[PDB]
Amino acid sequence: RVDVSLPGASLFSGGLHPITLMERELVEIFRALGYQAVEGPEVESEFFNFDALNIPEHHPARDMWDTFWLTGEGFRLEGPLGEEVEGRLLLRTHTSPMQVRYMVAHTPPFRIVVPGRVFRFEQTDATHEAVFHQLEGLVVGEGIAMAHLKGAIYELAQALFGPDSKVRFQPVYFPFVEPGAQFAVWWPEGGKWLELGGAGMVHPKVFQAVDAYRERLGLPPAYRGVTGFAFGLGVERLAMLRYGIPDIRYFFGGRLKFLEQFKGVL
Amino acid sequence: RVDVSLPGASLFSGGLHPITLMERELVEIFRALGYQAVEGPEVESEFFNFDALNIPEHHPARDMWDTFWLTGEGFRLEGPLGEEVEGRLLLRTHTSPMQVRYMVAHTPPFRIVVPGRVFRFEQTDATHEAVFHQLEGLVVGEGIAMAHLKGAIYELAQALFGPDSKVRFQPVYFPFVEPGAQFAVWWPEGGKWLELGGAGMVHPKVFQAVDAYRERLGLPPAYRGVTGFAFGLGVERLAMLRYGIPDIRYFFGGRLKFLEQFKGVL
Ligand SMILES: N[C@@H](Cc1ccccc1)C(=O)O
Ligand SMILES: N[C@@H](Cc1ccccc1)C(=O)O
Known part of the structure; x- marks a missing residue:
């Protein structure tokens, strides 16, 4: 037989x-x-991670990271236009520095979302990690207001948790x-x-840093008459609540018995 | 050794x-x-394919299909709400009937794009087929104008052929x-x-047919104070110009030596 x-x-x-799954869904939502x-x-470099983002040194605010x-x-770190850049190297403490890199390399108006691995010196436990992921959001252009930031997050919520x-x-x-x-x-x-992330209207000094770096590079200013909003949200926290995962350490753990559990969600 | x-x-x-590749790219463009x-x-049924779309019988305009x-x-054909429907059956001659099915099952404002296989009685040659694909577009809501239709197509072109x-x-x-x-x-x-497709502001009679079918079904009217635009473009014609394909008959031909050539474009 x-x-x-x-x-x-x-x-x-x-x-x-x-994380790839969660990041994908988040990217799909914002692509739409x-x-x-x-x-x-x-x-x-310290410049993009901190200085360009209005976070000076010996700043009580620099302690938030x-x-x-x-x-x-x-090691040769290249800038927005491939040019080699200098400054004290570090592991980005957030994705925010990409806001600056992008703005000097492009022109408004635009909408970007930048996912990515970030690092912070912390004790890794059940709901804390030294190595996690964030997703930035940046929308710049004339007349861009906070009403739009609230609108963005509102759509994010609807798409993520229903009506x-x-x-x-x-x-x-x-x-x-x-x-x-x-x-x-x-x-x-x-x-x-659920607390997802932070956001706001791009700070006046960020645009100035951007255009200053631009002129210092030969490009013309492109951010004097525009406004914009930015946001950043943690990926793990969200992935956890969404896939019912108890320990954030698993993500980097490597247990197949763990990873294999998401073959379904693709 | x-x-x-x-x-x-x-x-x-x-x-x-x-066609799956071309359709995907087209869907990605409009999702964004x-x-x-x-x-x-x-x-x-004749109702959705023709009557609901202001194309009556013995109409010199019905000859365009x-x-x-x-x-x-x-055979049991179900309507927008699963209900069995009646009327002379046929193979849709375009995707347009989906505009009607959707509108009776949902409420404005919204943006849809409906891809799909369509059929027309014609002689299959080098640039003609009886079986091809179309992609519909439908955007309805208060204040929706033709300026928006032109804006849509403009973005389609940019995304498809560059600045x-x-x-x-x-x-x-x-x-x-x-x-x-x-x-x-x-x-x-x-x-x-390149001539890609046709479009326009949803005809006043389409909305009426929609709301009439709605009441006849118990739902309340939902299209009396809205306007909208619709468009439809042929997939093969575009796929051909984009992948440099000479004969439209290949799509349904089945030659592996042919299909295999698109493993690259995924
Ligand atoms: N980078 C911030 C998140 C954020 C991004 C953009 C605007 C406001 C807040 C953080 O690490 O918390
Ligand atoms: N259905 C039409 C295309 C079209 C769709 C929507 C609006 C206008 C034209 C055709 O077969 O040519």
Whole structure:
């Protein structure tokens, strides 16, 4: 007899990592809203990570990010236009520096979303990591207002949690935005207010840093008569609440018994 | 010796059909503009294919579509709300009937794009087919104007052919739109004006047919104070110009030597 219910050739079946899944969904959501995804480098200079974003040194505000400083010659970090740049190297503490790199290399109006791995010197536990992911958002152009930032997050919530979903905005501080704000979303199933990220209207000094670097590079100013909003949200926190994952350390853990569990969600 | 440059296990490598590729790119382009993709049935009733779209019978305008009529009992065609519907069956001669199905099942404002296989009784040659594909576009809502239709096509052209690309609109006739129009795009490489499809502001009678079917079904009217634009473009013509394909008959031909050639473009 030709047993048809017998195991067939053991061809391998692949899968995508949960962060890749979460990031993808997040990118899909924003693509539908007109956002384009671009990435930045993990090793940045203090200039892009801090100074260009209105976060000076010995600044009590620079303590909001526990930085990993680097050392070593021979490494050539290129700027927005491929040009080699200088400054104390570090691991970006957020994706925000990409806001600056992009703006000097392009012209408004535009919509970008920049995903990426970030690093912060912290003790890795159940809900904390030294290595995680963020997703930046940047929309610049004439007449761009905070009403648009609120509109963006509102669409994010709807797409993420359904029609019974809602967002709340509260003032908060960031050197690169003003007005500044933190936003939370209403997750119906969990019946809880989830804090997703921060945002605001691009700070006046950011545009100045951008155009200053531009002239210093030969390009003409492109940000004097425009405004914009930016936002940044943590990927793991969201991936966890969405795939029901208890420990954030698994993401980098490597357990196949763990990763394999997302072959379904592709 | 362990020859490392020797052929490895012959694992199969798949691929996607050129129309799937073209359709995907077209859907990606419109998703970025806020459009969502929904499909309709290939076997339609005269009501959705013609009557609901202001194309009555014995109408000199109904001759713009060479219809394939069908026969046979036992077949149960369901309407927008799953309800069984009646009328002379046929193979849709375009995707347009989906405009009607969607509108009765949802509420404005929205943006849809409906891809799909269509059929027309014609002699299949080098640049003609009885079985091809179209991509519909429908955007409805308060204050929606033709300026938006032109804006849509403009973005389509840019995304498809680059910044040196441009679109031209000329009046043309369609029973389901008014104003009516045909649009062509400027393809820089070929230095020629390509005619892509037709479009216009949803015809007043279409909205009426929609709301009439709605009440006849218990739903409340939803299209009395809105306007909208619609467009439809041929997929093969575009796929051909874009992948440099000479004969439109290949698509359905089945030659692996042909299909295999698009494993690259995924
Ligand atoms: N970079 C910020 C997030 C953020 C991005 C953009 C604007 C405002 C806040 C952080 O690490 O928290
Ligand atoms: N259905 C039309 C195309 C079209 C769609 C929508 C509006 C106008 C024209 C055709 O077959 O040519």
